[PDB]
Amino acid sequence: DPVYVDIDADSAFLKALQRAYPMFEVEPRQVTPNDAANARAFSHLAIKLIEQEIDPDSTILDIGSAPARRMMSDRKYHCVCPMRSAEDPERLANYARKLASAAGKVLDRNISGKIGDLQAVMAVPDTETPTFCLHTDVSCRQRADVAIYQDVYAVHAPTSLYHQAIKGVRLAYWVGFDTTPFMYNAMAGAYPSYSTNWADEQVLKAKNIGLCSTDLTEGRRGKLSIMRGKKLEPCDRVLFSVGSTLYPESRKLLKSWHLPSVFHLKGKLSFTCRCDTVVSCEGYVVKRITMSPGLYGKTTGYAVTHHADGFLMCKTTDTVDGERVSFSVCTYVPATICDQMTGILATEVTPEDAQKLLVGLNQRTNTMKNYMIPVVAQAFSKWAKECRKDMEDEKLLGVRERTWAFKKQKTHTVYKRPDTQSIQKVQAEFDSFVWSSGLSIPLRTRIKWLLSK
Amino acid sequence: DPVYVDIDADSAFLKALQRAYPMFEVEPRQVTPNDAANARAFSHLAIKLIEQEIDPDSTILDIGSAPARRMMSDRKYHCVCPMRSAEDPERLANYARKLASAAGKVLDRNISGKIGDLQAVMAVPDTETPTFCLHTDVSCRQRADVAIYQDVYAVHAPTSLYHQAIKGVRLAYWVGFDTTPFMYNAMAGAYPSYSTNWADEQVLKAKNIGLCSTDLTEGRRGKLSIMRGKKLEPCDRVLFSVGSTLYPESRKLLKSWHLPSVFHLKGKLSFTCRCDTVVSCEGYVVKRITMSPGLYGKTTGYAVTHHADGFLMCKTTDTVDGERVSFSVCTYVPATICDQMTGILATEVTPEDAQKLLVGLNQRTNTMKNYMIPVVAQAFSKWAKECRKDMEDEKLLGVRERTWAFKKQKTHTVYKRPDTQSIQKVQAEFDSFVWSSGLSIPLRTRIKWLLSK
Amino acid sequence: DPVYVDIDADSAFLKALQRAYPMFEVEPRQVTPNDAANARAFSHLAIKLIEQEIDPDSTILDIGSAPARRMMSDRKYHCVCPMRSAEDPERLANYARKLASAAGKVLDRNISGKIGDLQAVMAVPDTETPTFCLHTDVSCRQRADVAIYQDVYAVHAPTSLYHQAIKGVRLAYWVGFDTTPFMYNAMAGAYPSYSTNWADEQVLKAKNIGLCSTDLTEGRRGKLSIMRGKKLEPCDRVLFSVGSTLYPESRKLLKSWHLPSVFHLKGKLSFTCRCDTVVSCEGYVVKRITMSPGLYGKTTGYAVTHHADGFLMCKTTDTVDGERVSFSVCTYVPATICDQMTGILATEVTPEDAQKLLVGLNQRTNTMKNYMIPVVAQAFSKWAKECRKDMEDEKLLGVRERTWAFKKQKTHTVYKRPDTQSIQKVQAEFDSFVWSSGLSIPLRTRIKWLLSK
Ligand SMILES: Nc1ncnc2c1ncn2[C@@H]1O[C@H](CSCC[C@H](N)C(=O)O)[C@@H](O)[C@H]1O
Ligand SMILES: Nc1ncnc2c1ncn2[C@@H]1O[C@H](CSCC[C@H](N)C(=O)O)[C@@H](O)[C@H]1O
Ligand SMILES: Nc1ncnc2c1ncn2[C@@H]1O[C@H](CSCC[C@H](N)C(=O)O)[C@@H](O)[C@H]1O
Ligand SMILES: [Mg+2]
Ligand SMILES: [Mg+2]
Ligand SMILES: [Mg+2]
Ligand SMILES: [Zn+2]
Ligand SMILES: [Zn+2]
Ligand SMILES: [Zn+2]
Incomplete structure (x- = not known):
């Protein structure tokens, strides 16, 4: 009945985990000093919830699986493991070592x-087995009814889902980081509760x-480069750092998983699909x-995100390779701190005064990490000023001033308070969905040797 | 079950050791007044962890070994001991004395x-034995599956690893000081928790x-030397001092162990490798x-370091042989002190006022060593000034000012706060990897005499 | 198991002795009012430690021995006692009296x-006996494996060690005062904890x-001496005073025992040697x-000293024979007092104010002796001023100002804080190592008479 997580017993993250999973009993049990402990704990509980929701005797496909995590489960898993990273x-070698070390000792x-x-x-290396294969998510031939994606960021969502549906899959799950900051087109950001940047x-x-x-530098002046950049906008390549582990990602594939509530898949066979968020904890x-088969209803093309805590996006100034520039940065803010700044932000406040107030509220044990405080204080100061400016330029009801060209005001801060929602327009009608082993002889020999005895 | 360390029972370093090794029970037991006790305690616990992780019935190569440390172990070690220092x-004589004094008393x-x-x-002096040989890491012929490097700084990492892999080694470990300060190209630095400069x-x-x-000098003026230095930059030679023990090192070999997360070794045989940090305690x-055999995936060439406490690098002014110069210095700062200066650094502060605040926070028992306080106070003062200057020179979004030559600003301090990460670009594709006994007759005679009874 | 020392039970030096020898149990037992009690206690415990480290059944040479101290030991000693002081x-007479008074009563x-x-x-007076001889360290012919020097300052270290090695000695020990202040070339100094000047x-x-x-004098003016001294620099002759006992020493021989960590002895036979400091207590x-036989590795020529407490060297003004002059003086400072002056020395302070602050910290029982306070206060005042001057003359990174002749600044104080290290360059390659009884008939007759009954 209880669930054990590899985190410290005095951690403050334990309370947030309990609130997100009311149907379990969470107990700490620390064995390793892993620096990505919080991220691993969330994914461990997510798989337990999924197994409870679905019924036994069901076949599950694990896309981009690590087979060692499913070894001690009593459910039927079919691991799809191409060798592309x-x-x-x-991961394959770790799978074989655990299997040979458990033969003759575990019978269930x-x-x-x-x-x-x-x-x-x-x-x-071309045969399909009940529990293992070497194909990809498109070229696999096994039929099932449940599909699971755990921390997979390297596939195009509408294309991958369509190939799952024509094989009889009726339910799918996706676990990962929130894709909202990438729909706002930010340049950098943080997930402070998971030590992620x-x-x-x-x-x-x-x-x-x-x-x-x-x-360190003293500062020169020439740097004679005739070719002009002249512009600095986000590009496709993005670097992730969870703890001390590095992961490269692509912006196009990340945004493809920000699906609307209702969409249609149109091809040789047609389907009607629905997407819903069931768990959310600080990112x-x-x-x-x-x-489901067939075409029913109509689509609008809107995706909605509910904010339990504060979400910020502001403009900042820094030096890149010694040259001063400006770009945008996003972060998350705890709800208790947001509620305690309502009175202060009624008037104009300088960034220096806001920083001192935030320190007093925080260090009263830290509610938020201290390295994000300076950019939060700057964002709050600009938000109050822009709100004050709006009230002093009242317009008339039901008219638009166009004396024909209109002026656009400047915006430096976007602040989504707790209990508010974001909404964006995306595509909802899809009608376009258009092999080698890769294993080597030395690797095949090594796997065989580990399995023998 | 418990592990004993030769440190004082009232030492404050005991708590840090417990946090880094949650799977053990650490008990103090002081027998000697060794001035490098903290450094020796960390290495003692590191070997215990490695033995627990790997399975018995495995052959282990100990590169650059001191065979006396493995004499009471129940695992199979093969010590590679050339005589080059x-x-x-x-160390060889100490090994023979301990063996003869334990014969007939230890049977396991x-x-x-x-x-x-x-x-x-x-x-x-040319034969390979199951437990001892006189070759180097390149010319040894024994085959194993695990390799261990304990405080070895005298080999080129990609070259040494390749020769281990073609003999069937699949796992390797490296224990030593952090190589991050040498990637920033500092001139001097400290490891205050280990009494190392x-x-x-x-x-x-x-x-x-x-x-x-x-x-001491009164100050002359002439010092007529026509030849001009005109420049002061770091060179290859570096001196280390752990406690009261002196060790010379080389910058090129130190930086070669700052490996990326993924890299390839291409030669007659090809391998794909991964590097990960599992333990970290104050440097x-x-x-x-x-x-693993074969070539899989692709490489980026980035190395990532996670900071649990503060890391600093600043410019300082001193007199070298009576002449005033400037260079860079690095050090480590405890996390609690870093979090308590967030409010103060919101405005500009003089170096004198910062020093008095740091003394009050420290001496409230000492959290940090007092001899590094003056350079920390100076570094904090310049960091606050530069941040204020950036805020008052706001630029426009998405553009680069090049009115074509751009100006470079001056930077005097680099400050990595807790829960942040560094990232550097290094090489990740290697394709180039290109004997005498050295023992003397008098030394061989002495070893034989000690072994006889 | 316990060790007894002839010091007062309420002395504050007892705690420092316990910290330096964690492997013993120190108990006070006062029998005499000796004014060099602290120095004698340290040497007594040092010999006990050496006996524990080495194994029984070993022959030990005692160079410059006092045979009465080894009379009640159960180990085999060979006392080398020339009559040169x-x-x-x-000391010889004291040996004979104790032997005759213990015959028939001690049997072990x-x-x-x-x-x-x-x-x-x-x-x-020319025969070698197992326990006694009248030769010097060069002309003795007995073979052993351990050599001990206890408070011997009258030999040249590389020459003495070479003659011990060709007789089969593999280990040596040296006990005495710290040689660091003589490497800095000071004119006078103190060891306050041992009542030594x-x-x-x-x-x-x-x-x-x-x-x-x-x-006392009124002050004249003429003192007509045409010959000019014109210069005052240290010479070879130096006087020591331990308690109330006077000892003359030589600077050349004192500096010869400041050996580097690694050095070579090259002659008819070649040896490779290593030096290490195992105990240290306030000077x-x-x-x-x-x-070991043979030549291995390479040498750098550096010697390192680790400072557990503060070390000072400053310039002072005094009248010598009525004439005002200036020279340098060194001393030691307790670590607790050093740590409590960090905040004060952040700004400029006059010598008068520094003296009053030191008195308040000390007399709060005395941590440090009061007669050295005036020179410590003056040294601290000049150190703070020089640090302030350096901060106001910032230079550029990586360049040397030589507009070609450069100026040298004045330095009046050298301050080594606790947990820092000194480093000096010395010689590490030696290749040059190039008898009468002295007893009288009346002395021989007296010794024989004391032995008879
Ligand atoms: N097109 C594709 N179809 C199926 N799997 C793919 C794929 N492209 C990449 N993958 C696999 O997806 C994996 C993502 S890494 C995720 C591993 C595992 N889910 C875990 O949580 O640790 C990679 O190992 C890669 O081999
Ligand atoms: N190329 C090489 N291959 C193998 N060992 C080498 C080597 N170059 C130097 N060494 C050895 O590496 C040792 C490093 S000193 C480290 C000793 C031991 N690991 C300890 O913890 O104390 C030296 O003794 C030197 O003999
Ligand atoms: N060249 C030499 N070789 C051996 N002994 C010498 C020597 N020159 C001087 N000595 C002896 O060294 C002694 C130093 S006095 C030290 C005595 C004794 N170790 C103690 O602790 O009391 C002198 O008595 C002197 O006789
Ligand atoms: Mg990991
Ligand atoms: Mg040592
Ligand atoms: Mg006396
Ligand atoms: Zn399949
Ligand atoms: Zn070998
Ligand atoms: Zn003799």
């Missing part, structure tokens, strides 16, 4: 069949953001998607 | 075989750094490396 | 053999140092040296 050969699980399944694929490739030489490195979400 | 003949360990192995090498060879005659010596780290 | 005939020790050994030497011969007529004497140290 540099961390994959190590189908240990013998799993070992037999692995050997068959090694001899002929990300940044665009062009600003990796900044000075005062979470993920950067710079140098991690769980999504649930259903698919 | 002046401290090696003493393979004492008799170890004595027999040592005698065979003395007669013919280091400096470049050119600044050994300074006045107010950790490792220096100078004289002391443990790294884990895996190697 | 005026205190030697008295080899009392009968020691008495027989003494008589043989008197008849023929030393001074150069040229300043024995000063007024306000530890070891001096002067007269009193124990050194351990090992020697």
Whole structure:
């Protein structure tokens, strides 16, 4: 009945985890000093919830799986494991070591069949087995009814889902980080509760953001480069850092998982789909998607995000490789701190005064990390000024001033308070959805040797 | 079950050690007044962790070993001991004395075989034995599956790892000091928790750094030297001082162990490798490396360091041999002190006022060592000034001012706050990897005599 | 198991002794009012430690021995006792009186053999006995494996060690005062914890140092001496005063025991040696040296000293024989007092204000002796001023100003704070190492008479 998580017993993150999973009993049990403990704990509880919701005797496809995590489960899993990332050969070896070390000791699980399944694929790397295959999400031929994506960011969502549906899959799950900051087109940001920072490739030489490195210099003037950049806008390449682990991502694929509430898949076969968010905790979400045959209803093309805590996006000034520039940064703010600044923001406040007030509220144990305070104080100061300016320029009801050209005002801060919602327009009608092993002889030999005894 | 460390029972370092090794029970037991006790305690616990992680019945290679430390272990070690440093003949003699004094009293360990192995090498200094050899890491011929580097700074990392891999090694470990300050190209620095200071060879005659010596003088003017230095930049030679022990190092070899998360080794045989940091405590780290046959995935070439406490690098002014100069210095700062200065650094503060505030926070028992306070106060003062200057020179969004030449600003301080990450670009594709005994007759005779009874 | 020392039970020096020897149990037992009690207690515990570290059944050479101290030991000692100092005939008589008064009452020790050994030497003053001889460290012919130097300052270290190594000695120990202040070339200094003061011969007529004497005078003007001194620099001759005992020393021989960590001895036979400091307590140290045959590794030539408390060296003004001059003085400062002055020294302070603050911290029982306070207060005041001047003359990074001749600044104070290290360059490659009884008939007759009954 209880669930054990590898976190410290005095951690403040334990209370937030309990609030997000009211149907479990969470107990701390620390064994390792892993620096991504909070992120791993959330994903561990997410899989437990999914298994409870679905019924036994169901076949589940695990896309981009790590087979060692499913070894001690009593459900039927079919692991789809292509070898496309540099961390994959190590995961395969860890799978074989755990299997051989448990043979003859665990009897409830189908240990013998799993070992037999692995050997068959090694001899002929083209056969489908009940528990293992070497194909991709498009070229796999096994039929099931449930599909699971756990921390997968490298596929195009409408294309991948369509190939799952024509094989009889009616339910899908997606676990990962929130995609909202990438719909606002920010240049850098943070997930402070999970010790996570990300940044665009062009600003990796900044000075005062979470993920950067710079140098000491005296300051020259020439730097004669005739070719002009003249413009600095976000590009596709993005670097992620969870704890001390680095992951490169792509903006196009990240935004493709920001699906609307209702959409249609039109091809040789047609489907009507629905997307819903069931769990949310300070940047991690769980999504649930259903698919049914036929075309019903109509679509609007809107996606909605509910904010339990504050969300900020502001303009900041920094030096990149010694040159002063400006770009945008986003972050999350705890709800208690947001509610205690309502009275202060009724008037204009300087950034220096806001910083001192935030320190007093925080260090009263820290509610929020201290390295994000300076940019939050700057954002709050500009938001109050812009609100004050609006009240002093009252317009008339039901008219638009166009004396024909209109002026556009300047906006430096976007602040979504708790209990508010964001809404964006995306595509909702899809009608376009258009193999080698990759294993080497030395790797196949090594896997066989570990399995023998 | 408990682990004993040779430190004082009232030491404040005991709490930090407990937090870094949650899977053990640490108990103090002081027997000697060793002045490098904290450094020795970390290395003692690191080896215990490694043995627990790996499975028995495995062959382990100990590169650059001190065989006396492995004499009471129940695992199979193969010590690779060339004689290339002046401290090696003493280590060999200590090994023989401990073996002869334990013969006939310890039976669990393979004492008799170890004595027999040592005698065979003395007669013919070219044979490989199960527990001992006189070759280097390149010319050894024994095959194993685990390799361990404990405080080894004298080898080129990609070259050494490649020769280990072609012999069947799949796992490697490296224990030593953090290499991050040498990637920032500092001239001097400190590791205050371990009583360690280091400096470049050119600044050994300074006045107010950790490792220096100078004289008294009245001040002359001529010093007529026509040849001009005209420039002062870091060189290859670096001196280390742990407690009262001196060690010379080389900058090129130190930086070669700052490996990226993913890299390839291309030669007659090809391998794909991964590097990860598992333990970190105030500048002391443990790294884990895996190697697999074949080429998979792609590489980016980025190395990431996670900061649990503050990291600083600043410009300082001193007199070297009576002449005033300027260079850079780095150090580490405890996290609690960093969090308590957030409010103060919101405005501009003089170096004198910052020093008095730091003393009040520290001496409230000392959290940090007092001899690094003056340079920390100066570094904090310049960081606050530069942040204020950036806020008063706001630019426009998405543009670069190039009215074509751009001006570069001056930077005097780099400050990495807790819960932030550094990132550097390094090489990740390697394709180039290109014997005598050294023992003397008098030394061989002495070893034989100690072994006889 | 316990060790007894002849010091007062309420002395504050007892705590420092316990910290330096954690492996013993120290108990006070006062029997005499000796004024060099602290220095004698340290040497007593040092010999006990050495006996524990080495194994029984080993032959030990005692260079420059006092044979009465080794009379009640159960180990095998070979006392090398030439008669070259005026205190030697008295030490020999004390040896004979104790032997005759213990015959027939002590049975565990080899009392009968020691008495027989003494008589043989008197008849023929050229024979080597297992426990006694009349030669020097160069002309002795006994072979052993351990050598001990206890408060010996009258030999050249590289020459003495070479003659010990060719006789089969592999380990050596040296006990004495710290040689660091003589590497800085000071004119006078103190060891306040041991009631020890030393001074150069040229300043024995000063007024306000530890070891001096002067007269009252009204002040004349002529003193017509055509020959000009014109210069005052340290010379070879130095006087020591431990308690109320006077010892003359030589600067050349004192500096020869400041050995580097690694050095080579090259001659007919070659050796590789290593030096290490194992005990340190407020200026009193124990050194351990090992020697092995052959040539291995390379040398740098650096010697390192670790400071557990503060070390000072400053400029002072005094009248010598009525004439005002200036010279340098060194001393030691307790660590607790050093840590409490960090805040004060952030700004400029006058010598008068510094003296009052030091008195308040000290007399709050005395942590430090009051007669050294005036020179410590003056040294602190000048150090703060010089640091302030450096901050106001900032230079540029990586360049040297030589507009070609450069100016040298004035330095009046050297301050080594606790947890710092000194480093000096010394010689590390040695290749040059190039008898009468002295007893009288009346002395031999007296020794024989005391032995008979
Ligand atoms: N087109 C595709 N179809 C199926 N799997 C793919 C794929 N492209 C990449 N992958 C796999 O998806 C994996 C993402 S890494 C995720 C591993 C695992 N889910 C975990 O939580 O640790 C990679 O190992 C890669 O091999
Ligand atoms: N190329 C090489 N291959 C293998 N060992 C080497 C080597 N170059 C130097 N060494 C050895 O590496 C040692 C480093 S000193 C480290 C000793 C031991 N690991 C300890 O913890 O104390 C030296 O003794 C030197 O003999
Ligand atoms: N060249 C030499 N070789 C051996 N002994 C010498 C020597 N020159 C001087 N000595 C002896 O060294 C002694 C130093 S006095 C030290 C005595 C004794 N170790 C103690 O602690 O009391 C002198 O008595 C002198 O006789
Ligand atoms: Mg990891
Ligand atoms: Mg040592
Ligand atoms: Mg006396
Ligand atoms: Zn499949
Ligand atoms: Zn070998
Ligand atoms: Zn002799």
